[model samples]
Target: DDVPPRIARAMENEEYWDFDIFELEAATHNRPLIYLGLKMFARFGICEFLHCSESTLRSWLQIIEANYHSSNPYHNSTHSADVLHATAYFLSKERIKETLDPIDEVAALIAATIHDVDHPGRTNSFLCNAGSELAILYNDTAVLESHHAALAFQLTTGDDKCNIFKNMERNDYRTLRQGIIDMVLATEMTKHFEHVNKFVNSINKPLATLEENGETDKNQEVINTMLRTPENRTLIKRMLIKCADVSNPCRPLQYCIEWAARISEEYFSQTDEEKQQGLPVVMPVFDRNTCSIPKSQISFIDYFITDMFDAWDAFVDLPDLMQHLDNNFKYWKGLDEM
Candidate 1:
């Protein structure tokens, strides 16, 4: 997998930009637009990449307004962008090259970008509870995942997007399709353990072998061994993307606090609406005035970051990332006591 010159530059400079800087740059340069519309399309023969154009993205906003504006909180564009950014960040870390193919980065990045497009703001369980058409379409299993993938494919197959992949051979298309599918499906929490186990094992085996042999070369061999198993390799990529999927927990303290508040607002808003409609209250329902956002943030750090960084450390040296996690945890812990 040859590293495209532009992406190589981007990866090299990734550390210079924090999350906000990265997001601002991406939006200003229309990075997502170019990647989806040009890079991916050109490589895979999907279509011209501009199939439905900006209008399609606009339509997505409208759908969110009409259907998800109030009931679902976490399924917004910001969340999507956050996930995409985080996935790319982890993938760009120099340590990953030892264990992952560069092409996997491209595939993971694309999957993160499109994973929640046209989302209805509800989880699969919610859709099933509501007897939504999507639930029926997928027989109540992974309804949201099915919808995300279907909408993404629909866009890709359209005349505008289809041309992007036009030059791709059948096998190339299959590889792209499988990469996107596995990455997207891995987003569902139902698959979380499977994802985590695969990641843990991949790093653990290599680390174990290294400890016994006192050689880094043996660890590299372990990486190769893990990569040789397609499912394990895919899961390793998926785990990074998944970490980015909910990375607000590990962000700067102030930013993390803000996100926690927003998530609580979103969750509570949904719960309130559900109660009004005689529906059950979901977990993490918030009250604007009395909500314990800080407490939740602290709990999240302990539960999510503790495990994520543990897995990450086995394969990478991200001292700054570790420090950020510690700082965020301390901030949250102090806030919790107040």
Candidate 2:
């Protein structure tokens, strides 16, 4: 019943792609993440394999939502739901479906849904700069991501009912848990370029090699040599998860502008807090009144979004995604000129 009529219909529309997390947030009465998990997990048949208890799933979602700082403008449960939507959208694509095993799908969806669990609204940089407890605990390396995965697993295992992995075989369970960890950690922005580069050099380049070789792979040995390695598998997942984590810029401009504004405000709030606490500002551009939203977004697109998506699209060849990215970049550029 939490699935609103509009949202219920939107889910059926192939173009909607889990339509608007904010819309779902309002329609489901602020339970976006819960409904997102319910819709996508069931839609993609992840629930059948996990055989999770419905009540336990509800409880797990409750814990996940509660842990997120609702006060956060950007890094809250709604953002998690948004990322989950993106993950589901990507998984629906033929290339991704053909590439990922079912377990990989399950892990990517779960990881996307709870990737930012228990976030404090500030970034890993802020945590490290402030020498916060979590930063110290993680040794300033993927600090928040480590906490998110650890806390999520801890909450899931705290009770038999919430343990979705409870029904899995030992090996399956290990694979699922490891996949979740790797996917969550891959969201860290510090090593983002490395992930993108790995995807390019490992997957894209190797795929090109396969086509170039065109002469071999009859024995399956050559294809195996290219893509099935431990390193290559990790790169594929890291690249995909990272793309899902921050696909806002690739969204249609209407959504893209709002997301840019929302995240900009979140960053400015951090700057304001840091100023109050006398902590050094980690991102000087987010200095409230001194900052220009349009310029910052343009810079974000120029520095971060373009190269990553270029690498991603080279692998997946998502023309629609590239089109949206180009449109959104020009939109911001126009505003910056204004």
Candidate 3:
């Protein structure tokens, strides 16, 4: 890939700390040891596997830092990396082995990394309300999701990063691309329920029969076992990605408070810009007094977190994960009552 000298230099001067602290918080548990361990894993799991040289990985990190620093509060590189880490952790928990495949794991990690590359910082609703070019381009159907997927592929297709898939044949590339697209598009909240349902059904009726028998006949015993697993665990990996995407709410109170502040600022900034452009004022525009961030957080936990734990309880075999979910629930409960 032909990386511009200036861009390369800019990346070289960048620091990982410039990325969102909350992302680092989730991936590293705010601990140096955890950070080092994850970096090592990422090196082997993503960079090395994809044929990304250490220098190239550094450049990618640098680009993320320089481009994303404090711009798009929600859709930034930190969120991407955090989601990747969380997805990896959730899949490693063993109970969901029947549903996971090695290729799926690789695709999940890669998809998470590139899921929101070059995000424009505003939600699809914001774009539609403002009559933005992107909304027009995508015809308003998960516009941002499509754009991110395209841009990520564009980045990889360029000469500089093309070697990331160095020895892979055309078929391998196609499969990887399809996997990445499916996983990335699944991030769209509009498809949330559909993806969740598919996951649940797949878990209940494990795909192993298809692998073994090469038969299409559906068996009730297998189907029953699959449905016994909650829809959330069936889609648990994807759910983790989605949760990690919005995971600012799960941080320590002080960190969550900071994240909320940044997100509010970003939203209000866009609202103000829209109004200045003579665009229709989107409802709930920048009015923090009426915003009720806490209430919103409580509601979010009710929908996303509680459902997450219910699924975890249904399928997760790891005591550590169960405890983590319990601890997280307690944390949210304390916040709610506060």
Best by lDDT: 2
Spell out the clash pairs found in candidate 2.
Answer: none
Assess the local accuracy of residue 109 in candidate 2 as a C-alpha lDDT between 0 and 100.
89
Each model's C-alpha lDDT? 0.61, 0.81, 0.58
Could you give the candidate ranking by lDDT, starting with the highest? 2, 1, 3
Q: Is candidate 1 or candidate 2 better by lDDT?
A: 2
What's each prediction's TM-score?
Answer: 0.78, 0.93, 0.70
Cα lDDT tens digits, model 2, 180-288, are 9999998988887777877887787777777765666473466655565666766777888898888998887788887887898899999999999999888988977
lDDT of 3 at 324: 47
Cα error, residue 26 of model 1, in Å, equals 12
Error of 2 at 131 (Å): 2.6
Model 1 has how many clashing residue pairs? 15
RMSD of 1: 6.1
Question: How much is the lDDT of residue 194 in candidate 2?
Answer: 74
Give candidate 2's whole-model lDDT.
0.81
- Measured over all alpha carbons after superposition, the RMSD of each candidate to the real structure, in angstroms, is 6.1, 2.2, 8.1
* 324: Cα error in model 2, Å: 0.9
- In model 2, the worst 10-residue window by lDDT is 10-19
